[PDB]
Each structure stands twice: as structure tokens, then as C-alpha cells.
Amino acid sequence: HHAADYVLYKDATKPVEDRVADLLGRMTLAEKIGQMTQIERLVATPDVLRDNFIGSLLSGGGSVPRKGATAKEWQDMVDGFQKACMSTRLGIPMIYGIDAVHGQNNVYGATIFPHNVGLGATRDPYLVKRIGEATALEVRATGIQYAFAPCIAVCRDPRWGRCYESYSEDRRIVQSMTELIPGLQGDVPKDFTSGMPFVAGKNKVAACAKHFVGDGGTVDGINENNTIINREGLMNIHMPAYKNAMDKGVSTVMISYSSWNGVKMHANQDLVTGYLKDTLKFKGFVISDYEGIDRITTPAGSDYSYSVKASILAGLDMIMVPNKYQQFISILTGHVNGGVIPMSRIDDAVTRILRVKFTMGLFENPYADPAMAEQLGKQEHRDLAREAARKSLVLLKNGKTSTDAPLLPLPKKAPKILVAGSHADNLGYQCGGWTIEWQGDTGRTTVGTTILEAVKAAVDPSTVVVFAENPDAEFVKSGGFSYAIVAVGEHPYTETKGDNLNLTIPEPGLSTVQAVCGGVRCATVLISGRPVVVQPLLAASDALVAAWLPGSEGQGVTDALFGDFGFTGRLPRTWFKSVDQLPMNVGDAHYDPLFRLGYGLTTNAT
Ligand SMILES: CO[C@@H]1O[C@H](CS[C@@H]2O[C@H](CO)[C@@H](O)[C@H](O)[C@H]2O)[C@@H](O)[C@H](O)[C@H]1O
Q: Total domain count for the chain?
């Protein structure tokens, strides 16, 4: 067929489905099971990747080649792994995945965008699409081709430690925010069939709609727990955004740790094969969560043989093992050899994995583009993040009484002003979870601008800016301040350590706001992943802003505080009066909010 050593799957001009079928028909059982296996970079070596024909690698939260690694160091790491995979008999490139869920957030110097709850406050799907585009560039800067995003959970209880990863308690808002997908992957062609995977090429990444399904409905917002709701609530609240994801060509879907009415999602054939594959016609690949199959049993991992059987028969295609690959491969091999898992199931899994890889151009561009390194933290992306942060802010109060002068916007020229609070000069706190570390961290963990730095960058040069983290009342009264900006709120968290029943911010928080506001007119900036008990903060404050977790570009906060733009954000969640009310969502029969979903005050630019 020309060059005599012609191999159809290697021909870039051939249709994807032919390339897939041509490759699949050549593969051994070991090569097939290998494609279905995703491992952590922490256990990967060239020999492991080669000898086990490994299909994929990931960096989990915080899994980095080293602290402060450059874009090029990431590229070299990924390429080293890819070289080993390309040296197998069939030379099937690996796909490398990472949680780039608010920017390329594990990476030092990556732009950090606001978390999803704040993006929901913007009501601006095109903004989120643009965030997707920028995020894909920054992911490709590091040589990575696959992002485990978007999280399209509809969080129904803010006690959930991942509520900040949900755009909204209202599925319509979540559905509208699925525009992240064509940002990350590229717009699908005009003629596109819903459920087909799509990635436009080497400047884009495969996306992942997660976590399927009902991750946001767990009782008491307990992470990984039980979502007790009838089919109708599943289909009406938790499912719809997956259909929007299908229409936009999402390449992969990650299964939830959670259960739906006591059936583990990782073992749910009816939902994974019956509904996702056979009803929504999803033709991308279905990936497990991290040791998701282990958790089918209790205790987790107590019958790994059953875990493999149940998950693979339920219809999962790729397993995020991610560490005990040897055990996973041996066990699945055993099951296929003994007829417990038919070859048709293996071939369906591999067909889907290969379809994604071919479609996205991975066999044509398996290695990183060094020219992309400078997309990491690129200033235009930071300007986009700054826009997003600003648009995410919800003004909850702007004057203590209806006849008070509105405090916001503040004047940039004043003799002396105070910036205070535990969150005023702490980049880690303003980024929250999934930033550098899995759980986030405190202090200056990456490149960005804190609220304090933003204030100093914004004000007139005659304005004296004083910083005090936790000043007492006397310091404030004696200071001669025109006003104060005080930033407090939640510490960084994720899943189970964010699962919180009381939702009160840590002290000193309230006490600092009271000391400051008691001495001078104050704007309180609340940094949180979710609504928290706010009445005491409200009572003390002249103005109060819910800034959510705005990311690396704190100038977004000051853009609104000083009137360069008007406040436009609107609550994407219900603000409760008391945690005793929860769960309580817009449209419930007994709906008694402190602030209803959609609430937000506005301001004009000055
Ligand atoms: C405690 O172990 C740490 O867990 C985190 C989160 S679990 C799971 O991980 C996936 C891949 O990173 C995410 O896409 C998904 O949303 C999560 O539910 C994991 O990232 C760390 O690798 C792991 O040490």
C-alpha cells in the first residue's frame, strides 16, 4: 500500500474508525489491558510503561516532578514517559491526565482562575469558555493532553467539601457552564453527532465530565456517600448537564465514588452502560475515579478481584488504578482468560480509548511543543482571570441603613487606609483547594497578587496603605484611617476535610471584622468556597462582598472595590440563615433563605 511497510493505523490521512479497528485487530490481550490501565507518575518508570503497555498516566493532586518546576521540566517529564510508550511494539502513545480545574493548578506559575462556584456567580458562559481555552493552553505548556474537568456536580448541600467545584445548586446554571468543554477541546464541527468525543488538535486538551452521577446530592453533603433520590430527581437535577456535555463532544466521563440509592456508581451497569453509553450514545471513554473500584467493597480494597469484575462489567473503560497496576493487570488478565469478562467488553473499552487518542491527534503529536511553554501564566490569561474574579464577586451589603452613603465604590485617593484580616495578604487562602497541593496551602505558593498587593497597585500614590493582619480596636481608632478593607474567611480544603457541619469561619475572622468596623467604615471581603454563617459579619460591616475563591489575580477584587467596574455577580447558591435548615435549595417547599439564589447588589463604575 506504498512504502511496503505500510500500517494503516499509523496513516494520519485515514478515518479514525478505520485506524481504531486496524490497531485493535493487531493487539495482544496484554496490549489491550495495558490501554485500559492508568497509573500515577509516582509509580511509573520506562520499564513499567513499556513492559505493561500502559495506556495512560496521571498526576493526582500535588503529584509534581518537583516544587517550583518550570513548564519545560513538566514537558521533559511527560516526554520521557511518552518515549517509553512509543518504544513498545505498536507504539501507542500514552495520554497524560491532570486536575486542571481552575487553571493548570498543580503547576507553579500557572494562572489560577476562580473556582466554579464563583464562575456560576458570573452567569457568563462565554467567559467560562474563554477560561477553558486559556486553561488548555496552560495545560499544553506543560506537555499534558488531558484535563479532569469540568466537574458538573450540582451541589445540593453546601456542607459538602467540594461544593466550590460546583457552578451552582441550579442545574440550569451548571448546564450553561458546560461551555468550558468546547473551550478546553475546541468547538465541534457543524455536522457533529452528540456523544462522539472531540478534540481539535495539539493546542487543545481532552476534557472529562465528572463525577457521574449525583456527586452533588450526597446525604448531609458527605463526600463519597449515598445520593438518595428517585430516578426523577436524578434525571431532573443531576443528569441534564451530562447531556449538554454529550452535545459538546466531551471526550471522557469519570465515574463518582458515590452511590445512587445504595448502588455504587463504579458497579452500576444500568447507568454506565444502559444510560450513559446506550441511551446518551456516549462514544468516548469512561474512566474510574482514583481507586474508585477499590471502594466498591467495604472495607475498600478487601476484594480487588470483585472490584475489577464489577467495574469492567458495569462498563468502565479505563481504570485509574493508580498505584497497584501489577495486581490490576494480573487480575483482569485472569478474568478474561477464565471467561468471566468477555473479549467483547475488553475490545469495547480499548476501542473507546483509542478513538479518543486518534481523534485528538495524539498519534500525530505525541510529544510536547516547547514553543508552548510560555503560555504558562501568560499575562493575557491573568487578565482573563482578573476579569473572571471581578465578575464573580457578589455584593451582599453596601450601607448599614437605607439612608447611608454607599461605601462602595471606595475612592483611590485618601490620606490613609487600612487593609486587614487573615485573608488580605495570603495567596494560598484566596486560591483555596486544588492549588499547588491537593488541599491547597497557606502563603505565597505560586505567582499572583494578594488583596493587599492589589490595593497598593490601585490607589493614588498619595494614599498611605497600612497593613495589619489582626489589629485591635484601639489601633484602628487611633490610626486616622479613611476606611478599611478587611478580608477573612475559610482556609483551603477539599472533599472530606471540607465536609463541615457548622460552616462558621475560623477565628480570628469575625473578631477582626468587629474590631476594624467598630473603628472605621469597612468593606468586608469574605473568601469562601460556599455560603457560611454570615449574619454576624453582616451586622458589623458597612459593606460585604462574597468573593468566593477568586484565584491568583486579586486585582479582580479591587477592580470592583474601587469602582473601575460595577458589581454584577449574582448568588449561584442559596444563602442559608442557619445550617439547621440544610439542605435547602431554590424551589424547595420550605424555602426561607437569608439571600435567595440570584441575589446580588450592584454598583456603577466611577
Ligand atoms: C487522598 O488521596 C488524594 O486524593 C485526591 C482526590 S481523589 C480523586 O482524584 C482524581 C484524580 O486526581 C480527581 O480527578 C477526582 O476529582 C478525585 O475525586 C487525588 O487527586 C490525589 O492523587 C490523592 O493522593
A: 2
CB atoms within 10 A of CB 126: 10
Output the CA–CA distances (angstroms, integers) from residue 34 to 30, 272, 301, in the order listed: 6, 22, 21
Query: What does the alpha-carbon distance between residue 417 and residue 29 come to, in Å, rounded to a whole number?
Result: 69
Report how far residue 398's alpha carbon sits from residue 406's, in angstroms, rounded to the nearest whole number.
5
Q: Is 290 in the pocket of ligand 1 (CB under 6 A)?
A: yes
Give the experimental resolution in Å: 2.1
The letter for the amino acid at 27 is M
Is 135:434 a contact under the CB 8 Å cutoff?
A: no
C-alpha cell at 334: 485472569
Domain that holds residue 82: 1-377
Q: What are phi and psi of 452, to 5 degrees?
A: -60, -45
377, 407, 437 - which closes a domain: 377
Cis previous bond, 299, omega within 30: yes
Measured in Å, residue 106 CA sits from the centre of ligand 1 at: 12
Which amino acid, one-letter code, is at 156? R
Active-site residue, from 170, 215, 289, 542: 289
Q: How far is CA 53 from CA 12, 143, 357, in A?
A: 22, 20, 15
12 and 117 inside one domain: yes
Same domain, 398 and 362: no
User: Where does a domain end: 325, 348, 377?
Assistant: 377
Question: 105, 290, 294, 295: which to mutate for ligand 1, most atoms within 8 A of CB?
Answer: 290
The answer as to whether 584 is a domain residue is: no
Please report which helix (H) or strand (E) contains residue 89, including its range.
Answer: none
Residue linked to cell 451497569: 269
